[PDB]
Each structure stands twice: as C-alpha cells, then as structure tokens.
Amino acid sequence: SNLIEVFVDGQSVMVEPGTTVLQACEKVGMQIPRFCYHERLSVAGNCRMCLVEIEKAPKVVAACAMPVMKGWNILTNSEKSKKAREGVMEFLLANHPLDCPICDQGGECDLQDQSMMFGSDRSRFLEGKRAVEDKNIGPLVKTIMTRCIQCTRCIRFASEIAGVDDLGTTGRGNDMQVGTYIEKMFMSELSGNIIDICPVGALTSKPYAFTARPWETRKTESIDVMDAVG
Amino acid sequence: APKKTSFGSLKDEDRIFTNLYGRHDWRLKGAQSRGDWYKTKEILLKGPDWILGEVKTSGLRGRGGAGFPTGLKWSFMNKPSDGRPKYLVVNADEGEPGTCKDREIIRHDPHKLVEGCLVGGRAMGARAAYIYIRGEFYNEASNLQVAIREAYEAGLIGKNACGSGYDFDVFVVRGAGAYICGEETALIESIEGKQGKPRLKPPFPADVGVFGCPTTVANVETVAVSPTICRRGGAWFASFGRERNSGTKLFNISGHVNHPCTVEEEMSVPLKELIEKHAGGVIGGWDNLLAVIPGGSSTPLIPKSVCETVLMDFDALVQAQTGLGTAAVIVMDRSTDIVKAIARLIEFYKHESCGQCTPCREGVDWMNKVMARFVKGDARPAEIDSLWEISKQIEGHTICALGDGAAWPVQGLIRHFRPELEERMQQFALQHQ
Amino acid sequence: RFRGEHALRRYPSGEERCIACKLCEAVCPAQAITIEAEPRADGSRRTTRYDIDMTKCIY
Amino acid sequence: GAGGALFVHRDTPENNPDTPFDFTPENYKRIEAIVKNYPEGHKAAAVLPVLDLAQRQNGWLPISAMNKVAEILQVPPMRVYEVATFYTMYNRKPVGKYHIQVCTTTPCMLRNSDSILEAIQKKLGIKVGETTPDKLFTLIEVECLGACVNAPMVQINDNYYEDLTPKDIEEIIDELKAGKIPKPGPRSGRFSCEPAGGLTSLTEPPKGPGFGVQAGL
Amino acid sequence: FDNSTYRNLQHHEYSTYTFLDLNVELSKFRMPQPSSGRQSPRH
Ligand SMILES: NC(=O)C1=CN([C@@H]2O[C@H](COP(=O)(O)OP(=O)(O)OC[C@H]3O[C@@H](n4cnc5c(N)ncnc54)[C@H](O)[C@@H]3O)[C@@H](O)[C@H]2O)C=CC1
Ligand SMILES: Cc1cc2nc3c(=O)[nH]c(=O)nc-3n(C[C@H](O)[C@H](O)[C@H](O)COP(=O)(O)O)c2cc1C
Numbered sequence: 017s018n019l020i021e022v023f024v025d026g027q028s029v030m031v032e033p034g035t036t037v038l039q040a041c042e043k044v045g046m047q048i049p050r051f052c053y054h055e056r057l058s059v060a061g062n063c064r065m066c067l068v069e070i071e072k073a074p075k076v077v078a079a080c081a082m083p084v085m086k087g088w089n090i091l092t093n094s095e096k097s098k099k100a101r102e103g104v105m106e107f108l109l110a111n112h113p114l115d116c117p118i119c120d121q122g123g124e125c126d127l128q129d130q131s132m133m134f135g136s137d138r139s140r141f142l143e144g145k146r147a148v149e150d151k152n153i154g155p156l157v158k159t160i161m162t163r164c165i166q167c168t169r170c171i172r173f174a175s176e177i178a179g180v181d182d183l184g185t186t187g188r189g190n191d192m193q194v195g196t197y198i199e200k201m202f203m204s205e206l207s208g209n210i211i212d213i214c215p216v217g218a219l220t221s222k223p224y225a226f227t228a229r230p231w232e233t234r235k236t237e238s239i240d241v242m243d244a245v246g
Numbered sequence: 247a248p249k250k251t252s253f254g255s256l257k258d259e260d261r262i263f264t265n266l267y268g269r270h271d272w273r274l275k276g277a278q279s280r281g282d283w284y285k286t287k288e289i290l291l292k293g294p295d296w297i298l299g300e301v302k303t304s305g306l307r308g309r310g311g312a313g314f315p316t317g318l319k320w321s322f323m324n325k326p327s328d329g330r331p332k333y334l335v336v337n338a339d340e341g342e343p344g345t346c347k348d349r350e351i352i353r354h355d356p357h358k359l360v361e362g363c364l365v366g367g368r369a370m371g372a373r374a375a376y377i378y379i380r381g382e383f384y385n386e387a388s389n390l391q392v393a394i395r396e397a398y399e400a401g402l403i404g405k406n407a408c409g410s411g412y413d414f415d416v417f418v419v420r421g422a423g424a425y426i427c428g429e430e431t432a433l434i435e436s437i438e439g440k441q442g443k444p445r446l447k448p449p450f451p452a453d454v455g456v457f458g459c460p461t462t463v464a465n466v467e468t469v470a471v472s473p474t475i476c477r478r479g480g481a482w483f484a485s486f487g488r489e490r491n492s493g494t495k496l497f498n499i500s501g502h503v504n505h506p507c508t509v510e511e512e513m514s515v516p517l518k519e520l521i522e523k524h525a526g527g528v529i530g531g532w533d534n535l536l537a538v539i540p541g542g543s544s545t546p547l548i549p550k551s552v553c554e555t556v557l558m559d560f561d562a563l564v565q566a567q568t569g570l571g572t573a574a575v576i577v578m579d580r581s582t583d584i585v586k587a588i589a590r591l592i593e594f595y596k597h598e599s600c601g602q603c604t605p606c607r608e609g610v611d612w613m614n615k616v617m618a619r620f621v622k623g624d625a626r627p628a629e630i631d632s633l634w635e636i637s638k639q640i641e642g643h644t645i646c647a648l649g650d651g652a653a654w655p656v657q658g659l660i661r662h663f664r665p666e667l668e669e670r671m672q673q674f675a676l677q678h679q
Numbered sequence: 680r681f682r683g684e685h686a687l688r689r690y691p692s693g694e695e696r697c698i699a700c701k702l703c704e705a706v707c708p709a710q711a712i713t714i715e716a717e718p719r720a721d722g723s724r725r726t727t728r729y730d731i732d733m734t735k736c737i738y
Numbered sequence: 739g740a741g742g743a744l745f746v747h748r749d750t751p752e753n754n755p756d757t758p759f760d761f762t763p764e765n766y767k768r769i770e771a772i773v774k775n776y777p778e779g780h781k782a783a784a785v786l787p788v789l790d791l792a793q794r795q796n797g798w799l800p801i802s803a804m805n806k807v808a809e810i811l812q813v814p815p816m817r818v819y820e821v822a823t824f825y826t827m828y829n830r831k832p833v834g835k836y837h838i839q840v841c842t843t844t845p846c847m848l849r850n851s852d853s854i855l856e857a858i859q860k861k862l863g864i865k866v867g868e869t870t871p872d873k874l875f876t877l878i879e880v881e882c883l884g885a886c887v888n889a890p891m892v893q894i895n896d897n898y899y900e901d902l903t904p905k906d907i908e909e910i911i912d913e914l915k916a917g918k919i920p921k922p923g924p925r926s927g928r929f930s931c932e933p934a935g936g937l938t939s940l941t942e943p944p945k946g947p948g949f950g951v952q953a954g955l
Numbered sequence: 956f957d958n959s960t961y962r963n964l965q966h967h968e969y970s971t972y973t974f975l976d977l978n979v980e981l982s983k984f985r986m987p988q989p990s991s992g993r994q995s996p997r998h
C-alpha cells in the first residue's frame with residue numbers, strides 16, 4: 017500500500033510513513049538501547065543512547081526520534097554505532113554514584129544491564145563526582161537524585177499521563193536537577209508509576225525499600241481487585 | 247581582468263554598513279539619506295520569487311557562522327500555506343566570545359535590519375518578524391524599538407507596508423542571559439516562554455518552528471544585507487570574494503592587537519592583511535604573534551605559521567583545519583599562556599551548556615576539569631590522548647552544535663600545542679618530586 | 680588466606696559493615712546464606728536475618 | 739568555578755509565598771501590551787518578559803512574584819520556576835542597587851580584566867560574589883557581554899562601561915556612589931568599536947539613495 | 956557634513972521602562988494576531 021521499504025542490516029522491511037529508526041529496527045526483533053525513550057511517552061531525544069549509523073550517512077542519528085527514509089540501511093551493530101554507545105555510556109557513568117550494593121535498583125537496572133551489554137568494562141574518569149541533595153515528594157516515592165541520569169521520563173509522565181505539572185528541571189548544565197523547586201508532594205492516584213519508568217534507583221518504592229532483590233522473587237501473574245478496572 | 251586573485255582593499259562606496267561607527271544619525275532620516283528604504287515598494291512588488299532569485303544569485307551564505315546558502319534556506323518557505331501563519335525570526339543573540347558585530351548593526355543601523363526584515367519576510371511569505379536580542383543589549387534594543395516606531399509612523403511597516411499592499415509586523419523579544427539561546431531551535435523555544443533547550447532536527451523550522459508554524463531563523467547580518475543585495479543586484483555582491491565565498495563581511499579583531507576594532511572588509515582578505523591594516527598589527531610586531539582564533543571561540547586556533555597566508559573565507563579556513571565562524575579574530579601574542587586561554591573558553595562552554603543531552607552535559611564539565619588540571623600540569627601525558635578521545639565522543643553525538651563548539655578548541659590546542667602541555671606536566675612532576 | 684569459620688565484621692566506630700546487598704547470598708554455590716533486611720530505626724540499610732547453614736556450606 | 743547558588747527554594751520569612759508582591763497598574767498595562775504581541779492560545783510566550791518586568795519593579799524575584807506571574811499567565815508555577823532558574827539574568831536573591839558584572843572571558847582576559855576585577859574588589863572591599871554592607875553594590879563575574887572589541891568592559895544596570903583601566907572603574911564607582919549618572923561607553927576617548935588609530939575606513943561621505951541600484955528596479 | 960561627532964547619544968537617557976513603554980506605544984500599530992482556536996494547549 018503506502019508502505020516504504022527500508023533495510024535493517026541489509027534485511028528488507030516494509031514500514032508505514034512516520035516510523036522511526038528504532039521502530040523499524042524492532043520490526044526485525046532488534047532492540048535499540050534506550051534511556052529517555054518510552055513508547056507511551058512523548059519523544060525527548062536527550063539521552064543519546066539510541067544513536068545508530070545509517071549507511072552512507074556521515075553522522076549517526078537518534079533512532080528514537082528520526083523518521084526512517086525510503087532506502088535507508090540501518091547498521092545496528094557497526095563500529096560507529098558501538099563506539100557511540102560506549103561513549104554515551106561513559107558519559108552517563110562519569111558522575112553516577114557507586115551505590116549498587118545499597119541501591120534498590122540493583123539486579124533490575126537498565127543502566128547496569130546496558131553498561132554490561134553496550135558499554136566498556138572499565139573507567140578512565142579521574143575527577144570528583146557531583147552530589148545533589150534529595151527532594152521529598154511524599155511517603156510513596158523515595159528520592160535519591162545523585163543517581164538521576166536526567167532522562168525526563170518522570171516529568172513527561174507527570175505532565176502527559178497524570179496531568180500534573182509539578183515536576184521539572186531547575187538550573188542548567190551539569191547543575192541541572194529534576195524536581196519541584198519547592199517542598200511539594202507528588203501525590204497522584206498514578207504517582208507510583210514514576211518508580212517503574214525511572215530507569216535508575218533515583219526513584220524507588222519507599223514501602224518496598226531494602227527488603228528484596230529482583231532475582232530472588234517469584235512472579236505470579238494475577239488480577240487486581242481494588243477497583244472494577246481489573 | 248576577471249576572476250580577481252587578490253581580495254581586500256574594499257572601498258567605501260561598496261561597503262554595506264556605512265554607519266558602522268555611529269558617526270552619522272541612526273534615525274530614519276539619516277538612514278534614508280544613506281540609501282535605506284529606497285524603492286522598497288518596487289522590491290516587494292517584484293514578488294518573492296524575484297527576491298529569492300536575487301539572494302541565490304548573490305551567493306550569500308549564512309553570516310551567523312555556519313555559512314548555509316541563504317537563498318536555498320529561504321526558499322524552503324516558498325511553499326503554499328497549510329492554514330498556519332508564517333514567521334521570520336531574526337537572530338540577534340550574539341553570544342560567541344570575540345563577536346560583537348551584530349550589536350553595532352542594531353545600535354547604529356537599525357533601519358537596515360528593519361527593511362531587511364520586511365524584504366526577507368516578503369520573500370518567505372511571512373506575516374511578521376520576531377527579533378530576538380540578548381537581554382544585555384538593553385540600549386541597543388531600545389534604539390531598535392525607536393527605529394521600529396519610526397518605520398511604523400512613516401508607513402514603512404505594518405498594514406499596507408510601504409504602500410505595497412502586504413502586511414508585516416516587527417516584534418522585538420528580549421532574552422535573559424543565555425548563550426545557548428542563539429541556537430535557532432533554542433531561540434524558538436525561548437520565544438515560546440520555555441527553557442532555551444534546542445530541539446532535535448527534523449523537523450526543520452521551515453516545517454515546524456515558532457508556535458509550531460513555518461519559520462525561518464536568520465542572522466541579523468544576513469537579514470540586513472538583503473535589501474542592499476536586492477537593490478544593487480545579486481551580481482554586484484557576487485563579484486567580491488572567491489567563488490562560493492561571495493560578498494563583504496564584518497570582522498571583529500580583539501585580543502593582542504594595537505587597535506582592536508570592528509571593520510568591514512571583502513570576504514577572502516588574507517588574515518595578516520586584515521590584522522596589520524585595520525587593527526594596527528600585533529602587539530609587539532608580527533613576529534610576536536603566537537596564535538589566532540579566526541572565527542570566534544568555537545573555531546580551532548591556528549599557529550603563526552598558518553596565519554601568515556590563510557584567507558578569511560569559509561573554504562580556506564576549512565582547509566586550514568578551522569572555520570570562518572563569526573569572523574571574530576582573537577589574537578594572542580607570545581606572552582600568552584595558551585593553555586589558560588583555551589581553559590577559560592572551555593569554562594565558558596561549561597557555564598553555557600543547557601544540560602539537555604548527556605554528551606554535552608557531562609563531557610563538557612569533564613573536559614573543563616581536565617583542562618583546569620592541564621593548566622597546572624597536574625596530569626600525565628597519556629591523558630592528552632584521553633582528552634582527545636573525550637572530545638571525539640562529544641562531537642557529533644549532541645542535539646546541537648554547542649558540543650562541537652566545545653570539542654573543537656581543545657582539538658586545536660592538542661593539535662598545535664601538545665609540547666606546551668607535556669612541558670608543563672614535566673615541570674609539575676619535577677617541582678612536586 | 681586460609682578459609683575458616685565465618686564472621687561478620689564492623690567498622691572502627693562499631694557500626695556493622697554489612698548493608699544487606701545480598702551479593703553473598705546470590706553467589707553462594709550451596710545456597711547456605713539466608714538474608715532478610717529492612718530500613719533500621721535510623722533509616723540505615725541493615726539486615727534483620729543473616730543465617731549461614733554451616734552444614735550446607737562448602738567453605 | 740562551580741556555582742555557589744542553589745536551585746532548590748526553601749521558604750524564608752524574607753522569601754515565601756505570603757511575601758507581598760503585585761504589579762502596579764502601569765506595569766499591568768505593560769503586561770497587557772506584552773501579551774498582545776503573541777498569537778491567541780500561546781500566552782505562555784510572555785513568561786520571559788513579564789517575569790523580567792517583575793524584576794524591574796521589585797529589584798529581584800521572590801517566589802511570590804513567580805507565583806503571581808504564573809497566575810496571571812495561566813501557566814503552571816513549575817514552568818515559571820524552570821524559566822527563572824534557567825536564565826542567569828534573573829535575580830532569585832536580592833542584589834545591591836548597582837549590580838556590577840565584569841566579563842572575564844578570554845578576549846576580555848587578554849586585555850587584563852583581572853586588573854579591573856582587583857581594582858573593584860579593593861575599591862569596594864568585597865569579593866566576586868558579595869554585596870556591600872550598605873546594599874549599594876553587588877559584584878559578580880559574567881561571560882562575554884558582547885563587547886570584546888571594547889575590552890575590558892563592565893556592565894552596571896544594563897549600561898556598558900568599556901575600554902576600562904583601574905582608575906576609570908574607580909572613578910565610575912565614585913560617581914555612582916555619589917548619586918551621579920556616569921555616561922556609558924568607552925573611556926579611552928574613542929566613541930565606539932572604531933579603530934583608535936584614526937578611522938581606517940568609512941572616511942568618505944556616505945552615498946545617497948539609489949547610487950548603486952540595478953536596472954529594471 | 957563631518958565625521959567627528961558621535962551621534963548615538965540618546966541611549967544615555969534611557970530608563971528602566973523605556974523598552975516596555977515603546978512596546979506599549981507600538982501596540983496600536985499592529986495587525987490582529989492569529990488564533991490557534993483554543994485558549995491554551997491545556998484547553
Ligand atoms: N553569531 C554568533 O554569535 C554565534 C555563531 N555560532 C556559529 O553557529 C555555527 C553552527 O550553527 P548550526 O546552526 O548548528 O549549523 P547548521 O549547519 O546545522 O545550520 C546552519 C543553518 O542552515 C539550516 N540548515 C542546515 N542544514 C539544513 C537542512 N539539511 N535543511 C534545512 N535547513 C538546514 C539550518 O536550519 C540553520 O539555520 C557554528 O559554526 C558557529 O560559528 C555559534 C555561536 C554563536
Ligand atoms: C550554541 C549556539 C549558539 C549560537 N548563537 C548564535 C547567535 O548568537 N547568533 C546567530 O546569528 N547565530 C547563532 N547560532 C547559529 C544559529 O543556530 C543558526 O545557524 C543561524 O542563526 C542561522 O542564521 P544564518 O543562516 O543567517 O547564519 C548559534 C548556534 C549554536 C549551536
């Protein structure tokens with residue numbers, strides 16, 4: 017019909033207009049690494065983890081935001097793509113705190129896992145790290161913002177899904193902080209979801225804190241009875 | 247003899263910004279006595295296609311620093327409307343260190359910018375122009391507002407502009423202390439009352455711009471030469487400079503020169519000719535020259551041996567492993583701590599980063615720390631190569647070109663002054679035992 | 680380097696070193712370690728249960 | 739250096755939501771003129787000017803002023819907070835009557851902005867982030883005010899004083915503390931960005947209208 | 956005609972409200988603004 021033909025590592029894919037490079041890649045079962053992109057949130061393009069090389073294109077593109085063009089050959093595992101991923105991961109980890117043993121995210125952390133899968137194995141950062149103060153936003157969501165990677169996922173969720181415009185960024189540069197700028201509680205009927213979308217241990221569950229690790233839990237798929245939504 | 251091989255010695259009759267120094271009246275009457283607002287109605291009645299053709303023939307490239315062909319860029323708005331209004335945004339942020347050219351245009355030749363706004367908006371079929379000026383230029387913005395009021399009272403802009411039957415408005419919006427807001431998408435976001443964070447492209451502004459409408463962002467110097475280009479024709483502008491490097495250019499010479507100044511000169515003038523003719527020469531003679539940053543803080547420095555024969559155009563400076571940029575020449579003599587100056591530039595970029603994307607937000611601060619250590623000599627020589635790699639990681643992986651502008655000066659310093667860094671590290675290791 | 684009877688150590692201030700990360704429990708080849716944790720009265724990350732079955736342990 | 743300022747607000751008796759702020763009627767007319775400069779349905783574009791106007795009425799921006807702007811423009815207060823903490827020209831703490839801003843970037847540094855800064859520090863007896871005990875002066879360092887040709891230069895309350903020597907800035911401060919209005923601009927006897935050597939260009943009388951016009955126009 | 960005198964001296968008498976006063980004065984000269992059809996993106 018109106019579909020256009022693109023290529024993922026030379027494999028032909030038919031996609032509808034407006035499909036992004038990331039979506040075209042996942043049409044063939046390839047998941048592009050991501051931090052800021054979420055398919056139920058608006059596109060941000062700030063984390064730069066999804067950078068990928070297009071054949072015969074000198075500059076890599078942000079797969080989460082870039083619409084795919086007809087005839088494009090996306091190289092998901094080329095040298096350029098891998099080096100871009102390693103550089104971005106190095107930048108993300110330069111100021112990140114060495115909190116994994118005491119961080120509740122450990123074992124189900126996208127930062128940890130994508131560092132293991134797409135980053136290098138050592139450090140060459142020889143400076144001191146930044147440390148930011150913590151924000152109190154209620155008794156449900158525990159905040160430790162030194163772990164924040166500035167994804168903007170919580171802000172976009174609060175604005176778009178929950179309809180609450182209380183979250184934002186203050187400052188600029190390395191000093192940019194995610195918060196409310198005032199002592200304010202983010203008490204919404206949907207607030208707890210910001211724990212799950214947060215890729216890191218910056219936002220965690222306060223009732224759940226310190227009690228379990230992800231690998232020891234057994235998962236039972238069931239239905240909620242707290243309302244009639246099911 | 248066609249195909250000029252020597253460039254420079256620009257004449258006063260061929261200069262565009264004739265009140266650069268504010269020695270004549272900057273009001274409407276003085277501008278009209280100098281050739282402004284002359285037969286603007288006939289230029290508008292020629293139609294957008296004729297104006298765009300004149301700009302394309304003129305060979306004008308973007309004076310904001312990137313040098314994109316102006317006619318091609320303005321042609322993107324020649325599409326039929328889709329129900330949204332169309333807008334021209336004039337970039338008067340002027341944040342680049344060593345660059346003060348726009349300020350003089352605004353304060354001393356505001357009517358040139360206003361008529362350029364009218365002509366460019368007609369060519370692009372834009373309803374109004376928004377001029378974004380940095381908030382530190384309060385008196386310049388007030389002078390611009392006075393000139394706009396004069397043009398409104400004389401019927402030159404507004405309803406039935408110049409009697410041509412075309413309605414055009416000129417608005418001035420003031421920024422509040424942000425260098426990133428000179429980036430065109432960050433400027434658009436700033437106008438809409440948000441943080442000055444650049445948008446990803448695509449979409450380009452001609453598709454989705456200010457208020458989500460088709461928009462063209464153009465540098466003030468680019469805008470202010472268009473009415474003169476239309477009046478004298480594309481060919482007259484084309485003759486000056488090398489091929490594909492046409493026209494005249496405003497140069498700001500600062501640093502270690504005897505007479506730092508802003509001057510107008512032909513495009514492909516040699517750098518040595520410019521410095522020794524208009525700026526009075528290097529402090530202490532030409533042999534005292536250590537390095538020159540030719541196009542503002544974002545262009546890599548070049549040592550003295552390169553500055554002697556290099557030409558001040560886009561292509562020549564690209565061949566010299568640098569850029570024309572804003573044509574802001576910062577001169578440093580042999581008494582300069584070359585590491586410390588570049589470290590100060592890196593600190594500037596650290597304080598100006600908007601913080602949106604990971605490579606700039608983290609790596610520019612990282613490079614600032616490394617350069618602060620390099621000034622003292624605290625590091626080891628291996629770290630030099632490490633620093634180079636860090637810059638390469640940052641470059642091309644960021645939403646906007648501030649990352650490029652932070653990576654390039656470090657690369658220039660490493661390329662041309664690695665022995666100085668190693669020598670400083672040797673001294674630090676010696677004295678601290 | 681000799682491996683003998685297990686012990687839990689302290690910081691020089693007397694504070695426990697263990698912060699209930701459960702890496703020892705995860706790595707243990709005999710599943711000899713059982714750990715339960717909760718925030719302490721002062722908010723610290725500390726164990727409430729730390730058991731080693733020395734008849735399961737392979738040392 | 740690392741910014742000593744904080745980007746989290748804690749309520750204080752001097753600065754809290756109950757701190758009294760309101761726009762004067764003249765400033766309300768100015769706000770109306772500002773808002774009419776943008777298309778209908780895009781009122782938030784007026785956040786930057788109106789906020790700035792509040793500063794021009796108040797000297798600085800207490801959190802009550804940000805809340806008032808947010809209420810006036812129908813904008814969530816957090817968006818106004820983002821704008822106020824992003825842009826450096828907004829004063830979220832009170833400053834002195836004369837905010838002195840010294841450019842220390844490389845083009846100005848090469849022209850000895852350090853001498854100007856030390857002269858100011860010695861003449862006022864404060865440091866590069868402090869306020870005088872009489873609340874008349876505040877001194878900070880800024881990046882590239884856009885007059886690099888006229889380096890070294892200083893901005894005081896949206897006025898530029900350029901081509902500075904330590905004696906020049908000391909005289910300027912003396913004139914300021916006596917209530918006088920020092921004339922902005924260069925202090926070297928040179929009017930503007932022109933070469934000091936004698937105007938190497940634009941010496942001929944400017945041409946008239948239509949001098950170079952092409953045929954057919 | 957002469958080049959000796961500096962002619963940009965009016966900015967020496969600009970006050971805190973000069974820019975916004977000029978905006979208020981310019982308000983009467985402008986064309987009616989376009990409309991998106993709603994009061995805000997939250998309407
Ligand atoms: N005038 C000043 O004070 C400053 C100037 N600069 C200069 O800005 C330069 C880099 O700026 P950028 O905008 O990032 O360069 P750019 O090449 O990405 O864009 C240049 C212009 O051409 C347009 N353009 C480029 N590619 C296009 C395409 N494929 N389709 C449609 N339009 C396109 C862009 O919309 C833009 O307006 C730097 O070299 C720097 O020298 C930087 C800071 C301050
Ligand atoms: C960090 C940054 C700052 C910039 N600042 C300015 C500026 O102050 N003035 C300007 O004209 N262009 C600036 N630019 C370039 C603009 O983004 C854009 O390319 C230019 O305004 C286009 O106008 P032109 O095509 O007429 O040159 C900047 C770019 C970047 C990346």
Ligand code: SF4
Binds near residue numbers: 126127128216
């Ligand atoms: S967020 Fe992930 S990487 Fe960071 S400390 Fe927690 S577990 Fe470790």
Ligand code: SF4
Binds near residue numbers: 167168169170218
């Ligand atoms: S708290 Fe989590 S979701 Fe919010 S900005 Fe930080 S990393 Fe992103």
Ligand code: SF4
Binds near residue numbers: 647
């Ligand atoms: S490169 Fe720097 S200024 Fe540009 S968007 Fe990224 S963080 Fe912001």
Ligand code: SF4
Binds near residue numbers: 698701
């Ligand atoms: S849980 Fe085990 S590995 Fe973790 S700190 Fe305590 S003793 Fe060490």
Ligand code: FES
Binds near residue numbers: 060063067080
């Ligand atoms: S996932 Fe695309 S930039 Fe973050």
Ligand code: FES
Binds near residue numbers: 843844
């Ligand atoms: S370096 Fe001082 S004004 Fe630009």
Ligand SMILES: [Mg+2]
Binds near residue numbers: 121214215219
């Ligand atoms: Mg989380």
